[PDB]
Scaffold this active site. Structure first.
Site, short mmCIF file in Angstrom:
data_model
loop_
_atom_site.label_atom_id
_atom_site.label_comp_id
_atom_site.label_asym_id
_atom_site.label_seq_id
_atom_site.Cartn_x
_atom_site.Cartn_y
_atom_site.Cartn_z
N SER A 232 39.07 37.55 38.04
CA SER A 232 39.59 37.46 39.40
C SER A 232 41.10 37.38 39.30
CB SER A 232 39.09 36.19 40.10
OG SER A 232 37.73 36.30 40.47
N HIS B 299 38.99 30.25 44.91
CA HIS B 299 37.90 29.73 44.10
C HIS B 299 38.24 29.40 42.64
CE1 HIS B 299 37.31 34.05 42.96
NE2 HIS B 299 36.83 33.53 41.85
N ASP C 227 39.40 33.80 50.84
CA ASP C 227 39.21 33.23 49.51
C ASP C 227 40.52 33.48 48.76
OD1 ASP C 227 37.79 32.00 47.44
OD2 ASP C 227 37.09 33.93 46.61
#
Lengths: 81, 46, 149, 149, 46
Positions: free
Chosen positions: D101, D27, D49
């Protein structure tokens, strides 16, 4: 005047309505409705029973998932996230 | 003819439909009882 | 984690945030005295006399974990110390009354071990009727002659 | 081992050299701010992901090993100390924001234990959504209501 | 003759070709589903 058989399946079944007497088909329809109600009541009871089974394991902590599949369609989908 | 409630219907064919019923209400009743039995087993297990 | 069920402005029992669900005994009349909790959709379970729902994300940090691990010895609960032995939780008779359902029985590390539902009076001590975790799954222990609190 | 993904000259997330691959959340928009890493060919995986590639030989000495071994307790991460328990990593709400992240959660011996993907706010604390190693294989734990950072 | 869309073709021979098709699209659809199922097993395993 006729060399045709009886019925097969229901078709002819409705043809008889012309014979015998007035009362007939409506009563049968009512009986069918009652049968449907019994079928619906059974399903409703079954769903409540399915809840009764998923009960206990309704609190928290690992343990199915697990038996949740094989698992009467919920069971899962239900275990998860 | 001879009796009351207008008899009509079908050997074979007739049996085809009859054999179905008696057959699903009883099943779900038995399954319900079995589920209760298992529930009691869990209750005993606790 | 503990929230009180009120009925006609009167505390009937309690509700508890255990794991990721929101619990409260099914037999308890009233509605949880907390907006967020009250508007939830609970799933009743008459076998367990339990009635759970899911904790809103903004309160999930407020839950209490529970554990299947419960060695004979003493546990903690609001009114004092519960005693566990022979697969039975007990307390000095009189120390638990109607309106105590929902109250958790913690251990010394804070893990909720069981949730009180009621108790059976067997003299000096009362054997509690609780909701307890097994290997992984929930269970309910109800001593003979329990009086649902 | 940690490298930053930049997008229009702005840090969006991170990339990490774990094992023998080069990871970065799928992402995350941008390209790794490192020549050697940027020119690589990544294999996307929408289930996880994740978006991995292989570490160039000249940087393989720069990787970080990770481990399936994670006992309840406290772990280390750039913003402080993460807490592991009940099969869930959490942190004081506010201590992790979008753009975190890719950041690894190390243990006290340096082994990368999980890689943050985002977090779900559940009040006081936020349950992290991470990529973690199982017996041998990778896995992804995503708490209900996670906000992908 | 008698109907519409110009019928033409071949018993035997006709069956030879027909038997092929229905046969590979369905296969890859089933395989796709099976792969998803296994993927979910892995997800559960983690």
């Amino acid at each position: 005047s006729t060399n045709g058989t009886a019925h097969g399946h229901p078709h002819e079944i409705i043809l008889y309505y012309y014979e015998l007497y007035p009362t007939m088909t409506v009563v049968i329809v009512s009986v069918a409705s009652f049968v449907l109600l019994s079928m619906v009541g059974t399903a409703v009871g079954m769903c409540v029973c399915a809840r009764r089974r998923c009960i206990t394991p309704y609190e928290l902590t690992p343990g199915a998932t697990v038996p949740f599949l094989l698992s009467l369609l919920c069971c899962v989908r239900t275990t998860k996230a | 003819h001879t009796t009351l409630g207008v008899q009509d219907i079908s050997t074979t064919a007739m049996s085809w439909v009859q054999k179905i019923t008696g057959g699903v209400g009883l099943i779900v009743a038995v399954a319900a009882l079995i589920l209760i039995v298992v529930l009691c087993v869990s209750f005993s297990r606790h | 984690c503990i929230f009180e069920v009120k009925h006609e402005g009167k505390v009937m029992g309690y509700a508890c945030l255990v794991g990721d669900k929101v619990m409260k005994p099914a037999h308890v009349k009233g509605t949880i005295d907390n907006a967020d909790l009250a508007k939830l959709a609970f799933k009743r379970s008459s076998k367990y006399d339990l009635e759970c729902a899911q904790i809103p994300v903004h309160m999930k940090s407020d839950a209490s974990k529970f554990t299947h691990e419960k060695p004979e010895g003493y546990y903690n609960w609001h009114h004092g110390a519960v005693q566990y032995s022979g697969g039975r939780f007990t307390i000095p008779t009189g120390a638990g009354k109607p309106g105590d359902s929902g109250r958790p029985i913690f251990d010394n590390k804070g893990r909720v071990v069981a949730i009180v539902l009621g108790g059976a009076n067997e003299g000096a001590r009362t054997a509690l009727s609780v909701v307890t975790w097994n290997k992984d799954i929930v269970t309910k222990i109800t001593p003979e002659g329990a009086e649902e609190w």
